[PDB]
């Protein structure tokens, strides 16, 4: 029996505690994996028991809990539980353009937009989920959808206004046999 341990930061302890039943129930019910949260090591531990139905379910659960810790909602990583062709690609915001200080903050703003609206628009077009950590961007979706979302985000964080980005991603989504 093998196990996987994944860490949790201090800012994700309370979301883990509130959503704990919605996390451990799908892992143990139909995947059949033991789960605990070590408070000393601050780790979510997932284990294979005799009740595990099939191999690689523990990898599925590990991706689910890792996606929840990175900042995604519990149902958007339950999508990683159910679907097979889903991945979790992430990058830093300074990876494409060296931005210092206030400029960097403005880049973060034009991933969000007003009220988060711009971000949601990309999530509507690329069919992905984007999480903005403090200087990090995480995309959950299919491989081509991750490519479209990262193209939109990289276009946003090197200077393009949101309307041009919307038009470009709508043209690409029309061309992508969606």
């Amino acid at each position: 029996e093998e196990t996987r341990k994944i860490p949790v930061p201090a800012n994700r302890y309370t979301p883990l505690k509130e959503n704990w039943m919605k996390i451990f129930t799908p892992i143990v019910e139909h995947l059949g994996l033991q789960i605990r949260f070590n408070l000393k090591s601050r780790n979510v531990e997932i284990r294979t028991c005799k009740e595990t139905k099939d191999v690689s379910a523990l990898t599925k659960a590990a991706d689910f809990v890792k996606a929840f810790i990175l900042g995604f909602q519990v149902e958007d990583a339950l999508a990683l539980i159910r679907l097979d062709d889903l991945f979790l690609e992430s990058f830093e915001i300074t990876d494409v353009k060296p931005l210092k200080g206030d400029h960097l903050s403005r880049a973060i703003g034009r991933i969000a937009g007003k009220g988060g609206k711009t971000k949601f628009t990309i999530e509507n077009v690329t069919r992905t989920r984007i999480v903005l950590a403090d200087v990090k961007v995480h995309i959950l979706g299919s491989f081509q959808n991750i490519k479209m979302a990262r193209t939109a985000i990289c276009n946003l964080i090197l200077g393009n206004p949101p309307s041009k980005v919307y038009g470009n991603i709508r043209a690409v989504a029309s061309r992508s046999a969606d």
């Binding site: 093998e2 996987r4 191999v55 690689s56 990898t59 991706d63 062709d85 991945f87 979790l88 690609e89 992430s90 990058f91 830093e92 990876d95 494409v96 353009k97 060296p98 491989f143 991750i146 990262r150 193209t151 990289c154 276009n155 090197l158 200077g159």
Partner: protein, 135 residues
């Protein structure tokens, strides 16, 4: 052909899964890492440069390596994930995840999942200019 091990104990290799931003390498080596066992790229399974970094090529690569390691007697693998690192991005891509899952399906016991990406302490200059990178 392989180690003379009883059925209870497993033979451990170290699988370096390096997902560059153009293809993916599956490099099973010794515990020392000096003597290799198997390696298939994203490019030796799909005949297109467009789909070189695709998760399809990575998963086919992982099945090929898993079959080869079953042939040579290695039954379990430690995992050392990698991105390009240095000035470049540090997170292993979806191809590395696809290869890891595909070798997890293919009867392999998994050991330790550990990320060795060459994070610089204090890097040199980025390959792109001041204007930016990646469209």
């Amino acid at each position: 052909l392989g180690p003379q091990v009883a059925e209870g104990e497993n033979v451990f290799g170290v699988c370096h899964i390096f997902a560059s931003f153009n293809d993916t390498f599956v490099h099973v080596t010794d515990l020392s890492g000096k003597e290799t066992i198997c390696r298939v790229t994203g490019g030796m399974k799909v005949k297109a440069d467009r789909d070189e970094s695709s998760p399809y090529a990575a998963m086919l690569a992982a099945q090929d390596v898993a079959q080869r390691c079953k042939e040579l007697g290695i039954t379990a693998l430690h995992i050392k994930l990698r991105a390009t690192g240095g000035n470049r991005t540090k997170t292993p891509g979806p191809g590395a995840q696809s290869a890891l899952r595909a070798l997890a399906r293919s009867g392999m016991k998994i050991g330790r999942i550990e990320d060795v990406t060459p994070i610089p302490s204090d890097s040199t200059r980025r390959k792109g200019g001041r204007r930016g990178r990646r469209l």
